[PDB]
Design an enzyme around this catalytic site. Structure first.
Site, PDB file in Angstrom:
ATOM      1  N   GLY A   1      -1.539   3.726  12.161  1.00  0.00           N
ATOM      2  CA  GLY A   1      -1.917   3.930  10.829  1.00  0.00           C
ATOM      3  C   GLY A   1      -1.012   3.051  10.148  1.00  0.00           C
ATOM      4  O   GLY A   1      -0.458   1.976  10.551  1.00  0.00           O
TER       5      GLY A   1
ATOM      6  N   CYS B   1       2.140   2.631   9.015  1.00  0.00           N
ATOM      7  CA  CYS B   1       3.463   3.008   9.400  1.00  0.00           C
ATOM      8  C   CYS B   1       4.699   1.901   8.964  1.00  0.00           C
ATOM      9  O   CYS B   1       5.900   2.244   9.235  1.00  0.00           O
ATOM     10  CB  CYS B   1       3.814   3.378  10.502  1.00  0.00           C
ATOM     11  SG  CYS B   1       3.222   2.263  11.874  1.00  0.00           S
TER      12      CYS B   1
ATOM     13  N   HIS C   1       0.750  -1.074   0.023  1.00  0.00           N
ATOM     14  CA  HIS C   1       0.041   0.062   0.190  1.00  0.00           C
ATOM     15  C   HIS C   1       0.828   1.123  -0.011  1.00  0.00           C
ATOM     16  O   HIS C   1       0.322   2.211  -0.303  1.00  0.00           O
ATOM     17  CB  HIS C   1      -1.022   0.002   1.070  1.00  0.00           C
ATOM     18  CG  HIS C   1      -0.505  -0.293   2.501  1.00  0.00           C
ATOM     19  ND1 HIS C   1      -0.354  -1.481   3.111  1.00  0.00           N
ATOM     20  CD2 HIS C   1      -0.079   0.706   3.647  1.00  0.00           C
ATOM     21  CE1 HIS C   1      -0.053  -1.321   4.242  1.00  0.00           C
ATOM     22  NE2 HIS C   1       0.224  -0.358   4.556  1.00  0.00           N
TER      23      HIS C   1
ATOM     24  N   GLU D   1       0.649  -8.431  -0.207  1.00  0.00           N
ATOM     25  CA  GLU D   1       0.732  -7.080   0.200  1.00  0.00           C
ATOM     26  C   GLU D   1       2.244  -6.739   0.631  1.00  0.00           C
ATOM     27  O   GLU D   1       2.356  -6.090   1.610  1.00  0.00           O
ATOM     28  CB  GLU D   1      -0.232  -7.032   1.372  1.00  0.00           C
ATOM     29  CG  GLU D   1      -0.814  -5.684   2.016  1.00  0.00           C
ATOM     30  CD  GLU D   1      -1.334  -4.974   1.066  1.00  0.00           C
ATOM     31  OE1 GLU D   1      -1.570  -5.283  -0.056  1.00  0.00           O
ATOM     32  OE2 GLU D   1      -1.324  -3.592   1.387  1.00  0.00           O
TER      33      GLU D   1
END
Length: 180
Positions: free
Chosen positions: A145, A147, A40, A71
């Site tokens: 978040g 990170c 992401h 991912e």
């Protein structure tokens, strides 16, 4: 106990902070010019690494045999400096551990070291609409978040942190066979 010292040793040499259009992420160098980021992060051909520009020679968004997302993005850095080869520390199969450490190392969370404890194999998650395989879960009763992060136990790099929900956090499994 020993997961911490291990974590630090890995982060000391092989971690960096990377800033893309999608935020700021811990990156993990694995060997040669090859590093891993969470997918992401969506790195372009120039990344910011410790706030300096670095050219990306090659990128690989990993998928399993079925082309199901994992991912993880591998990236090949235009640098003459080699990473310390930590391929021998990556998980070969065994990914459920009693004592893990999450290590986040960004400009917002420098040198953050969390003892998350027990790591459970989850398997599938829907990460922002994308089915994703080989997910790991751990207690993480906080924010953070996207990170990035490095999930580790003593002697083993386990996973790359893709986020959390205020109670649990999640990693992508970082398998030895991904790098050869």
């Amino acid at each position: 106990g020993p997961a911490f010292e291990f974590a630090v040793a890995m982060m000391k040499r092989n971690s960096s902070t990377v800033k893309t259009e999608y935020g700021e992420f811990t990156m993990l160098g694995i060997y040669d010019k090859w590093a891993v980021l969470p997918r992401h992060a969506k790195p372009g051909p120039t990344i910011l690494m410790n706030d300096q520009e670095v050219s990306v020679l090659d990128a690989k968004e990993l998928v399993d045999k079925d082309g199901t997302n994992l991912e993880l993005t591998l990236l090949k850095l235009n640098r003459n400096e080699k990473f310390r080869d930590i391929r021998g520390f990556l998980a070969k199969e065994e990914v459920e551990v009693n004592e893990a450490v999450l290590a986040i190392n960004t400009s917002k969370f420098p040198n953050m070291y969390i003892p998350v404890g027990q790591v459970t194999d989850y398997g599938f998650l829907n990460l922002g609409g994308t089915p994703t395989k080989r997910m790991l879960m751990y207690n993480f009763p906080t924010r953070a978040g996207q990170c990035g992060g490095v999930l580790m136990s003593t002697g083993k790099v386990l996973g790359i942190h893709v986020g959390g929900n205020g109670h649990q956090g999640f990693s992508a499994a970082l398998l030895k066979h991904y790098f050869n």
